[PDB]
């Protein structure tokens with residue numbers, strides 16, 4: 001029995017509770033978050049845990065800053081069938097009386113599942129008093145000074161009668177592992193440790209190394225191979241982004257987190273569909289799917305840039321990459337409405353050339369460089385193979401021309417090139433006609 005629990009009845013109230021009413025605002029806010037805010041109730045577990053994390057962080061930040069030693073920082077959950085209750089305690093930083101009397105709105109999600117909510121909290125500030133807070137969700141809550149309150153916050157939820165399911169250990173376990181696996185602080189359920197995965201996307205890219213990226217890749221992609229490509233991308237400049245993107249070793253989606261808290265599974269709009277082969281995670285604080293598209297554009301540009309930069313530091317690895325995933329790139333080009341989205345994506349295309357040795361590939365932009373004068377012509381020919389292409393007469397005029405011609409060997413490459421009628425300021429025309 002390595003049983004580890006901190007949740008116990010140590011709290012007592014000596015005086016009477018003072019009765020308060022929420023302000024005309026908060027009654028609506030509490031009402032709403034219960035009534036319409038969350039699509040499925042279970043997420044209350046998700047919110048409270050998140051709160052429990054934040055508090056803990058704020059404690060750890062304080063102590064470490066003052067050079068003080070660290071106490072046990074933990075999050076504990078307790079289910080009870082006989083009492084029909086679910087409990088969540090964190091020792092983190094607490095709440096002063098002021099804070100209790102008058103993070104966000106996550107807490108109030110608890111009233112999606114509760115007849116009444118009973119809370120005990122203490123601030124980590126020296127010589128702080130503990131307090132009890134009681135609510136029916138009415139508009140009436142109660143505050144009293146409590147004894148036997150541990151530093152941090154203890155929330156006791158008396159589930160309403162159709163929500164006794166969250167009094168079951170198994171159920172709550174499932175919810176926890178679903179949304180809360182990557183919590184930053186040790187999390188216990190009924191005395192047992194329940195979490196172990198590290199939110200490596202939050203780390204400094206220079207601290208994350210291979211074995212970790214490999215583990216995480218296998219987890220998020222549910223795969224047994226390795227990522228051939230890894231992009232660890234962080235920004236505050238446009239929006240808040242902590243992301244990791246993987247390209248699988250094997251030939252043929254992204255999870256949406258916020259603050260290490262699972263928002264969505266198998267999300268389809270974070271990345272453009274032509275990038276649906278990408279695996280990994282995107283974490284952002286700019287979250288509630290009508291307008292998530294800022295992120296989509298930012299990530300599309302960042303990923304295109306990434307691959308373009310991959311083609312330079314390594315030539316043949318990117319050649320195999322284009323061989324195995326060129327499908328999605330052509331598809332993306334033909335799909336995109338605006339022209340230069342087409343062209344951005346077209347910067348990833350690799351084709352053989354009349355100039356280069358048979359077996360080597362070239363991008364379009366490289367093609368722009370070689371041409372001397374005569375802007376407004378890009379020359380291409382599609383044929384069964386390189387040898388066949390070389391013979392063809394129409395090129396022959398080109399061969400004594402001094403102008404390079406690209407070589408395609410599949411109709412989908414030529415169709416792609418025909419759709420993308422123009423690259424940069426130069427037209428893509430076929431040497432025959």
Ligand SMILES: COc1c(C)cnc(Cn2ncc3c(Cl)nc(N)nc32)c1C
Pocket residue numbers: 051052055090092093094095099100103107119133152153
């Ligand atoms: C019942 O009291 C409240 C009310 C009235 C509003 N919001 C919350 C959530 N909340 N707010 C601060 C805070 C801290 Cl420091 N730790 C933890 N775990 N939870 C927190 C509570 C607990």
